[PDB]
Structures are given as structure tokens and as C-alpha cells.
């Protein structure tokens, strides 16, 4: 059977600015003879662990796996990493409805806006593993809490971008402090 | 691929109880809420409480309350239901189900179900 | 607790026919911040429920045309606007608007032919 997978991690995060450094890893059991790091956009490969990208370009965002081979028997495939783009259209905004300072308990909904031309947003938790996609695709999206708890607390941003390339997306919004008590 | 794979069927004497895991595989464990639904064989749909994998907090409904216990183990992304003192209306369905953290589009994923059977 | 109130039980209709189905809840599901939080699932037998429609009338990603809601207050409505064989199943609303969540009792699909 195959070796199990290795892991594929991005830091300083997936979602890079525009011109900003950004490491992709694959980590798999010490020792191992071969690494194996594709992009799923691409028809090559790279026979090593580390992708060091200098500066964030449009054409480097998108969807990667990668792979090792250990006494001839190849691994299975990492999770994919979706490595993002960021900063490469005019930031949305993003707002709170009731407002930023909600009691614990009810809902708090976070609304995203930019002009017509982008369908999708995802929101970023400082801190958090990774964003929030919204199945919405209108210029306008809402992200409902529905019980709001002091965890849902935080520093927030707002991100658009549209279906047509998924990981380009826009300068993240001002961030939104949720405060719930 | 998005998966929440569920242990298999159970038979339990009325009394005991049952405890049910839910895997899940395929996104960010922590980015969405657990919650467990039950179906009686031929009946309709009830909610039974969920638990947030980040902090491990819970919110049950009261018709549970004092019975049920959720936890999860973030190191296997794994959801535990452990539903104690079972009677014959607890033969059930049991399926765990995933809802964002952030977001109203719940119970998008489910798992496959466990069937329960309380029976001496 | 909240009832939700679906009818009719269950139905029968000819491939391409027009389907309603009513949710209603005993209570308002206008939240204390204006909102209101119901979705319809789609069971077919031996299989988990499916999530069509969220936020009473939003479709989830991938999920056929024919298939919408509409409503609020206390009256909810879900409709297949044209009959598909393949969607013979039961199908269920569920409010998360007020704790403890409840659904409606489900309205089973069946074709006539």
C-alpha cells in the first residue's frame, strides 16, 4: 500500500499580499529519499520539499499538493494548500449588524460589500487556522453568527474576489473588532 | 473530498447507554460546529445539541440535558455522542452533522447515521 | 420550544407538476435583530438528510433551479417548480432561530405515473 501523506503547510500564511514572502513545506517522516511538490495549475513538478516564493505574483496563487517517495514506494498525496493572493483588487468593505460590541447569546452578522464584478468573500479571524468561504455569489454577502459566544470574539477581515480566479483575491477590508461579552 | 464517517450499529440494553464517534476528514475541524440529529425508524428529525471543536463548549437541548455528552478529540478530528440511560424511544438514527462556526448554512455535511437499537 | 407545522404529510404529484410545501412556526422566527434562520432539507430513503435551501430562501452551492423558499414570520414556503422522478424523498423544514432547533415533521414526495 501507499506511505502515508505528508503535511503541506504554508508560513507565513496562505494569504499572501501581492510582493510578499511565503514558504510552502512538505513535511513527511525524516529521512525520506524524494519529495515531490506540484501546483495543480501546472504540467511540471519539483523534486524538493521547499517552495520558497520571494514575492507573491498573480500566477503563483492556486491549489498545491505534494508527495514522497520512500524505498521505491511513493506516498499518498498531501491535503491540498490553497495559496492565495491577496491585495489585487480595491478592499471591500465590511461592517456588523447590530453592531461590533453584541451581547453573548443573540446573532451578530457580518456583511461584506464591493462593486458588481465580484461574487464571492471570505472572511479572516487573526488567529484563526483559515478563512471563511460564503456559498453567496452577489456583490454583497452576509455571515450570520446565529448564537454568538465570547470565542466568536476577534480582530476580523473581509475579503472579494470572483469565481472566475478563485485565489486572487482583493486588499483585505479594515478589520472589524467583535467584541462579545 | 469532505467526509464525517460515523462508528457502526449498536445494540444496548435500556439503562445503559451508547456512544457514538464521528470522523471527519477533508476541511478545518475547528471551523465548524459538531451537532448530532436523531431520526426514530419511520419518524421525522430531532435535534439533540451540538459542540464547538475549538474550546470544546456545548449547548444541548433540555430534553437532553443531564443524558447527553458531546466531546471531540481535535488531535483525530473526531466528535463523540454519548447519550446515557436508554429506553425504547431512543432506538434511533444518529448522525452527526457539521455547521460553520461562522455562517447559517448548517448541517451541509452529514454523516452516514449509526443506527441505535435499545432492546433487551 | 418552537413547532414547526409542515404540510401537507406527504403528496403525490406527475413528473413536471408544480410541488408546495408549507412550514409554519407556532411562534415569530423575526429574530430581537431582524433575522431569521430556517432551511429545507432533502431526505431520500436510506440516505442522510441534504441541505437545499438556507436562510428561507437562499439555495446552497450546486443545488438545482427548480428548488426554492420564500416566507417569514410564521409562514414558510418551499417549492420544486417542476417535479424530477429522482426527487421523490422526504423533505423537512428547520428553524435555528430560537434554541431548542426544531424541524417540521416532514412532507414525503412521491410520482405519480
Known amino acids: 500500500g501507499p506511505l502515508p501523506k505528508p503535511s503541506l503547510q504554508a508560513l507565513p500564511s496562505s494569504l499572501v499580499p501581492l510582493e510578499k514572502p511565503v514558504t510552502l513545506r512538505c513535511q513527511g517522516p525524516p529521512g525520506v529519499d524524494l519529495y515531490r511538490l506540484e501546483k495543480l495549475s501546472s504540467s511540471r513538478y519539483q523534486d524538493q520539499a521547499v517552495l520558497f516564493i520571494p514575492a507573491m505574483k498573480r500566477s503563483l496563487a492556486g491549489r498545491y499538493r505534494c508527495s514522497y517517495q520512500n524505498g521505491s514506494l511513493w506516498s499518498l498525496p498531501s491535503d491540498q494548500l490553497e495559496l492565495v493572493a491577496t491585495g489585487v483588487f480595491a478592499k471591500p468593505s465590511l461592517s456588523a449588524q447590530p453592531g461590533p460590541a453584541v451581547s453573548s447569546g443573540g446573532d451578530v452578522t457580518l456583511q461584506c460589500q464591493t462593486r458588481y464584478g465580484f461574487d464571492q468573500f471570505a472572511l479572516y479571524k487573526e488567529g484563526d487556522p483559515a478563512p471563511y468561504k460564503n456559498p453567496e455569489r452577489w456583490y454583497r454577502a452576509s455571515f450570520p453568527i446565529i448564537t454568538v459566544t465570547a470565542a466568536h470574539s476577534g480582530t476580523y477581515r473581509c475579503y472579494s474576489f470572483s469565481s472566475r480566479d478563485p485565489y486572487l483575491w482583493s486588499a483585505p477590508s479594515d478589520p472589524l473588532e467583535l467584541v462579545v461579552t | 473530498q469532505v467526509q464525517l464517517v460515523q462508528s457502526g450499529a449498536e445494540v444496548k440494553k435500556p439503562g445503559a447507554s451508547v456512544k457514538v464517534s464521528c470522523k471527519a476528514s477533508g476541511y478545518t475541524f475547528t471551523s465548524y460546529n459538531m451537532h448530532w440529529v436523531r431520526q426514530a425508524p419511520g419518524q421525522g428529525l430531532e435535534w439533540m445539541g451540538g459542540?464547538?471543536?475549538?474550546?470544546?463548549?456545548?449547548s444541548y437541548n433540555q430534553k437532553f440535558q443531564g443524558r447527553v455528552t458531546m466531546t471531540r478529540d481535535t488531535s483525530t478530528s473526531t466528535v463523540y455522542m454519548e447519550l446515557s440511560s436508554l429506553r425504547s424511544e431512543d432506538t434511533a438514527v444518529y448522525y452527526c452533522?457539521?455547521?460553520?462556526?461562522?455562517?447559517?448554512?448548517?448541517?451541509?455535511?452529514w454523516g452516514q447515521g449509526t443506527l441505535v437499537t435499545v432492546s433487551s | 420550544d418552537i413547532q414547526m407545522t409542515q404540510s401537507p404529510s406527504s403528496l403525490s404529484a406527475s413528473v413536471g407538476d408544480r410541488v408546495t410545501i408549507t412550514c409554519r412556526s407556532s411562534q415569530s422566527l423575526e429574530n430581537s435583530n431582524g433575522n431569521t434562520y430556517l432551511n429545507w432539507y432533502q431526505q431520500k430513503p436510506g440516505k442522510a438528510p441534504k441541505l437545499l435551501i438556507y436562510?428561507?430562501?437562499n439555495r446552497f452551492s450546486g443545488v438545482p433551479s427548480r428548488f426554492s423558499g420564500s416566507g417569514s414570520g410564521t409562514d414558510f414556503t418551499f417549492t420544486i417548480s417542476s417535479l424530477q422522478p429522482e426527487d421523490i424523498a422526504t423533505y423537512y423544514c428547520?428553524?435555528?432561530?430560537?434554541?431548542?432547533?426544531?424541524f417540521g415533521q416532514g412532507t414525503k414526495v412521491e410520482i405519480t405515473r
Open positions: 459542540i464547538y471543536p475549538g474550546n470544546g463548549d456545548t
Open positions: 436562510r428561507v430562501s
Open positions: 428547520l428553524q435555528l432561530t430560537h434554541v431548542p432547533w426544531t
Open positions: 452533522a457539521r455547521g460553520t462556526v461562522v455562517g447559517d448554512w448548517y448541517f451541509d455535511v
